Enzyme design. Structure first.
Site, short mmCIF file in Angstrom:
data_model
loop_
_atom_site.label_atom_id
_atom_site.label_comp_id
_atom_site.label_asym_id
_atom_site.label_seq_id
_atom_site.Cartn_x
_atom_site.Cartn_y
_atom_site.Cartn_z
N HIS A 1 -7.46 -4.22 0.66
CA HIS A 1 -6.18 -4.47 -0.02
C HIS A 1 -4.92 -4.06 0.73
CE1 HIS A 1 -6.27 -6.81 -3.70
NE2 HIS A 1 -7.58 -6.68 -3.50
N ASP B 1 -2.42 -0.29 -11.28
CA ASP B 1 -2.28 -1.50 -12.10
C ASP B 1 -3.47 -2.42 -11.87
OD1 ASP B 1 0.21 -0.58 -12.95
OD2 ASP B 1 1.31 -1.78 -11.45
N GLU C 1 5.99 1.60 -17.78
CA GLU C 1 6.37 0.90 -16.56
C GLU C 1 7.62 0.08 -16.82
OE1 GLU C 1 3.46 -1.17 -14.22
OE2 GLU C 1 2.09 0.57 -14.18
C1 LIG Z 1 -4.26 -5.74 -3.03
C2 LIG Z 1 -3.53 -4.88 -4.07
C3 LIG Z 1 -3.27 -3.52 -3.81
C4 LIG Z 1 -2.74 -2.69 -4.83
C5 LIG Z 1 -2.46 -3.22 -6.09
C6 LIG Z 1 -2.69 -4.58 -6.35
C7 LIG Z 1 -3.22 -5.41 -5.34
C8 LIG Z 1 -3.65 -6.78 -5.74
N1 LIG Z 1 -1.93 -2.42 -7.10
C9 LIG Z 1 -1.68 -1.09 -6.89
C10 LIG Z 1 -1.16 -0.28 -7.90
O1 LIG Z 1 -0.96 -0.74 -9.03
N2 LIG Z 1 -0.94 1.05 -7.64
C11 LIG Z 1 -1.23 1.61 -6.41
O2 LIG Z 1 -1.03 2.80 -6.17
N3 LIG Z 1 -1.74 0.80 -5.40
C12 LIG Z 1 -1.95 -0.54 -5.63
N4 LIG Z 1 -2.46 -1.34 -4.60
C13 LIG Z 1 -2.37 -0.78 -3.21
C14 LIG Z 1 -3.68 -0.05 -2.86
O3 LIG Z 1 -3.71 1.26 -3.40
C15 LIG Z 1 -3.87 -0.03 -1.33
O4 LIG Z 1 -4.17 -1.35 -0.88
C16 LIG Z 1 -4.94 0.98 -0.94
O5 LIG Z 1 -5.07 0.92 0.48
C17 LIG Z 1 -6.31 0.84 -1.60
O6 LIG Z 1 -6.92 -0.40 -1.25
P1 LIG Z 1 -8.41 -0.36 -0.67
O7 LIG Z 1 -9.27 0.47 -1.56
O8 LIG Z 1 -8.80 -1.81 -0.53
O9 LIG Z 1 -8.44 0.49 0.71
P2 LIG Z 1 -8.02 -0.17 2.15
O10 LIG Z 1 -6.80 -1.02 2.06
O11 LIG Z 1 -9.23 -0.93 2.65
O12 LIG Z 1 -7.83 1.12 3.02
C18 LIG Z 1 -6.61 1.84 2.96
C19 LIG Z 1 -6.51 2.95 4.01
O13 LIG Z 1 -7.38 4.02 3.70
C20 LIG Z 1 -8.44 4.07 4.65
N5 LIG Z 1 -9.65 4.21 3.84
C21 LIG Z 1 -10.37 3.25 3.15
N6 LIG Z 1 -11.40 3.88 2.53
C22 LIG Z 1 -11.33 5.21 2.80
C23 LIG Z 1 -12.11 6.31 2.44
N7 LIG Z 1 -13.17 6.19 1.63
N8 LIG Z 1 -11.76 7.56 2.91
C24 LIG Z 1 -10.66 7.74 3.73
N9 LIG Z 1 -9.90 6.66 4.08
C25 LIG Z 1 -10.24 5.42 3.64
C26 LIG Z 1 -8.38 2.77 5.47
O14 LIG Z 1 -8.84 2.91 6.82
C27 LIG Z 1 -6.90 2.46 5.40
O15 LIG Z 1 -6.25 3.22 6.42
#
Ligand SMILES: *Cc1cc2c(cc1C)nc1c(=O)[nH]c(=O)nc-1n2C[C@H](O)[C@H](O)[C@H](O)COP(=O)(O)OP(=O)(O)OC[C@H]1O[C@@H](n2cnc3c(N)ncnc32)[C@H](O)[C@@H]1O
Length: 491
Positions: free
Chosen positions: A63, A129, A242
């Protein structure tokens, strides 16, 4: 590297690990690691440590907007293959939270919710959200929604983690055990280790939510009313607050059609005053209640609670729905996006915190001018309380004020738009950040993305040396989450 899970080189696996929801970065890894558990993950980390150039990025559910989970010629760890590794409920006598559940860093919040509610009648109390996100993913940022004014973001509602560090150590941490790692990892942008398990706080699950939307034409009155509501004594007011900006017009994607909550009560723009601005404001409220509560009793409670608010008469919309359906409400928006084809086009989303003192200025230039015709998706703006955010965590919020705002410009790109369209959006996001920096606005990006050291130093401010110290401790080679671009891999 010897691991139990699968290693995939190239092909569709690499294609996927080179994509995120931003849709603007394509950076292919050497391999995708699909781990069974913490051992496979520490193996990946240790492999990267032995090599000259490998980096490791945990991928949650992809995401990210700006390539934060990508690893150019490195190893992307697909956390979804650990999604079912933990589910244990325990009780808390210390008052406050009823219980806790141990869940995988790779679990999606939507699944955590459904299982807690169906099996235990309990649920986490602080959300995002959108629930198609991972536990480790949001805890690496903050995890913000309409409950945060009351309980803090998701990083305020976890009491223990298992982490695979950038040294390759598997470590359990908390406020009492390895606390430096605990506080570093929370909001730490993946910089200090991979979260493999989180102990998430639980409360009894409500049965129902009264979901309310009311409309303001005056930003001063909107923000005064919202700040008043989030400042009320615990459990004397609403359970979710919100807000959002919408266009004053019939644009089905940007305008008033986006406000009503069911098909049988529509927005009547003849209720609006003649002097309305280009944009209008919606205050969104949620009240938790029990299945057994008399409807007249709940109606009376809601009239009392909403009764001092200065919203525009005749522009009040409400619906009642199960608590789980309320928390999953954004599925409706995902469906509209897939229908109009904008779910798969780029999403140059901008997310930031602005102090209470400066939100007026932000509205004046940003909402009322730069994005006055909307962004083709949500423009969220609502207040939060600093008291709920622990400054020991890696999270970065505005400098001054007990109240601050979160702002989200959730841009969508129509599928027939030119590539110049997306470039222009990115340029406008930059223009907003610049306008903030130039005018000394007390802002901080959430899900921050910067490419220069000077910007990161500015961002972390008086917590830069702490961030660097924590990096030297937990990932001195800078192998972890290189896509955040804060630290470059050691030579
Ligand atoms: C796509 C999106 C994102 C989103 C949202 C609605 C949509 C459709 N609504 C949000 C909301 O209402 N409130 C909020 O705080 N965030 C919201 N988001 C944003 C979302 O939090 C971010 O996209 C977040 O990164 C979580 O998404 P995801 O779980 O898919 O994690 P990622 O993007 O792949 O990785 C993010 C970073 O963290 C590192 N990572 C991933 N997993 C881990 C673990 N387990 N431990 C440590 N680090 C981790 C990744 O490498 C990256 O740097």
């Amino acid at each position: 590297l010897n691991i139990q899970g699968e290693i995939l080189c190239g092909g569709a696996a690499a294609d996927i690990a080179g994509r995120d929801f931003g849709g603007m970065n394509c950076v292919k890894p050497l391999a995708v690691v699909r781990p069974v558990g913490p051992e496979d993950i520490a193996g990946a980390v240790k492999a990267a440590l032995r090599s000259d150039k490998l980096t490791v990025a945990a991928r949650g559910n992809g995401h990210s907007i700006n390539g934060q989970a990508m690893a150019e010629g490195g190893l992307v760890v697909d956390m979804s293959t650990t999604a079912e590794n933990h589910f244990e409920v325990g009780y808390l006598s210390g008052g406050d939270a009823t219980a806790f559940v141990d869940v995988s860093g790779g679990a999606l919040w939507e699944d955590v919710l459904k299982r807690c509610v169906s099996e235990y009648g309990l649920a986490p109390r602080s959300w995002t959200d959108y629930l198609g996100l991972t536990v480790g993913g949001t805890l690496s940022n903050a995890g913000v929604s309409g409950q945060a004014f009351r309980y803090g973001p998701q990083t305020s509602n976890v009491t223990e983690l298992d982490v695979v560090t950038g040294n390759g150590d598997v470590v359990t941490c908390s406020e009492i055990e390895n606390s430096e790692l605990f506080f570093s990892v929370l909001g730490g942008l993946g910089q200090f280790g991979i979260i493999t398990r989180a102990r998430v706080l639980l409360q009894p699950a409500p049965d129902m939510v009264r979901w309310i939307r009311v409309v303001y034409t005056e930003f001063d009155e909107f923000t005064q009313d919202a700040e008043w509501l989030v400042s009320q004594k615990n459990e004397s007011s609403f359970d979710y607050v919100e807000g959002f900006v919408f266009v004053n017009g019939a644009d089905p994607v940007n305008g008033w059609p986006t406000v009503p909550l069911h098909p049988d009560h529509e927005f009547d723009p003849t209720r609006l005053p003649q002097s309305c601005g280009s944009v209008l404001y919606c205050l969104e409220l949620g009240l938790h209640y029990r299945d057994s509560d008399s409807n007249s009793t709940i109606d009376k409670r809601v009239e009392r609670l909403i009764g001092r608010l200065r919203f525009n008469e005749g522009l009040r919309f409400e619906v009642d729905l199960p608590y789980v359906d309320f928390l999953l409400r954004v599925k409706r928006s995902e469906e509209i996006a897939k229908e109009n084809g904008t779910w798969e086009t780029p999403h140059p989303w901008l997310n930031l915190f602005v102090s209470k003192r400066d939100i007026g200025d932000f509205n004046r230039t940003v909402f009322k001018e730069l994005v006055k015709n909307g962004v083709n998706g949500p423009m969220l703006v609502y207040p939060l309380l600093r008291s709920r955010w622990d400054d020991r965590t890696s999270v970065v919020i505005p400098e001054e004020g007990e109240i601050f705002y979160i702002v989200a410009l959730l841009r969508f790109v129509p599928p027939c738009a030119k590539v110049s369209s997306v470039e222009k959006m990115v340029a406008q996001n930059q223009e907003i950040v610049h306008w903030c920096v130039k005018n000394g606005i007390d802002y901080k990006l959430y899900l921050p993305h910067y490419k220069s050291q000077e910007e990161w130093i500015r961002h972390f401010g008086n917590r830069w040396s702490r961030f660097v110290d924590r990096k030297a401790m937990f990932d001195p080679m800078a192998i972890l989450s290189p896509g955040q671009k804060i630290f470059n891999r050691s030579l």
